[PDB]
Amino acid sequence: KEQLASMNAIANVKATYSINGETFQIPSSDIMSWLTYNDGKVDLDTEQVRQYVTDLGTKYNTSTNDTKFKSTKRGEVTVPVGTYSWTIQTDSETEALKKAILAGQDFTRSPIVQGGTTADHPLIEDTYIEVDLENQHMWYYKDGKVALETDIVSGKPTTPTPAGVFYVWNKEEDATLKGTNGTPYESPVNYWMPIDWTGVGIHDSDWQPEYGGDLWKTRGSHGCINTPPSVMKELFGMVEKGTPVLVF
Numbered sequence: 001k002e003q004l005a006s007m008n009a010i011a012n013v014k015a016t017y018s019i020n021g022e023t024f025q026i027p028s029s030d031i032m033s034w035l036t037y038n039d040g041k042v043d044l045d046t047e048q049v050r051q052y053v054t055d056l057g058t059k060y061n062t063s064t065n066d067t068k069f070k071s072t073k074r075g076e077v078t079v080p081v082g083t084y085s086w087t088i089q090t091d092s093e094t095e096a097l098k099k100a101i102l103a104g105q106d107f108t109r110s111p112i113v114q115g116g117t118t119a120d121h122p123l124i125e126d127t128y129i130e131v132d133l134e135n136q137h138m139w140y141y142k143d144g145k146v147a148l149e150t151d152i153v154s155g156k157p158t159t160p161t162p163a164g165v166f167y168v169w170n171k172e173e174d175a176t177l178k179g180t181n182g183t184p185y186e187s188p189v190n191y192w193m194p195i196d197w198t199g200v201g202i203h204d205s206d207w208q209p210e211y212g213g214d215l216w217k218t219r220g221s222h223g224c225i226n227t228p229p230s231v232m233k234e235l236f237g238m239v240e241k242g243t244p245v246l247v248f
């Protein structure tokens with residue numbers, strides 16, 4: 001029949017993926033090798049398509065692939081996987097991909113994912129909080145320009161601030177952190193910005209006379225990023241929820 005016109009159509013389909021800011025086309029050769037025919041219907045070897053999506057996941061998932069970050073004082077460095085990420089839902093994507101390809105019309109798409117944001121754009125744009133552990137300094141960029149910066153005091157050597165791609169998932173005022181040392185601690189805080197799932201976050205360090213330098217090795221935090229009370233207030237007021245926070 002003319003289901004040939006069909007099979008020829010999907011063989012020429014330009015399938016374009018947009019993932020983490022990168023664009024590429026699915027090679028025609030892969031499409032042709034997926035092209036199958038059964039039950040009198042033109043189709044795609046779902047097993048092969050699923051392997052391809054499983055590969056997209058392993059190659060691009062920001063949940064299992066570190067992020068290249070353009071730091072302020074060191075050029076491009078690698079920031080480990082953090083809490084701010086996404087994962088391609090294999091079965092949903094495979095089905096959506098097949099449907100798209102079988103339709104036989106050129107298309108561009110970003111994968112179906114689960115996480116803190118979709119994959120139709122780069123994980124890190126030009127708005128984020130940068131926490132340089134080596135320099136014990138913090139920057140807040142808004143649309144590509146520093147909107148505020150300041151020295152900070154990260155966690156002490158025993159309870160180090162973990163590196164990774166995090167994000168401000170919540171904002172609380174007059175909160176009260178709690179942890180151990182043993183011997184629990186309280187230490188109330190005027191502004192709390194959790195960026196982790198383990199207690200780590202940004203907050204005013206009222207009880208800290210000096211920030212920056214090597215302070216953390218002496219009077220280091222329990223993991224949080226201690227911030228000068230006055231700065232923290234201005235930060236909190238301008239940092240929107242969902243803002244990425246890179247710690248390296």
Ligand SMILES: [Zn+2]
Nearest residue numbers: 221222223224
């Ligand atoms: Zn603390």
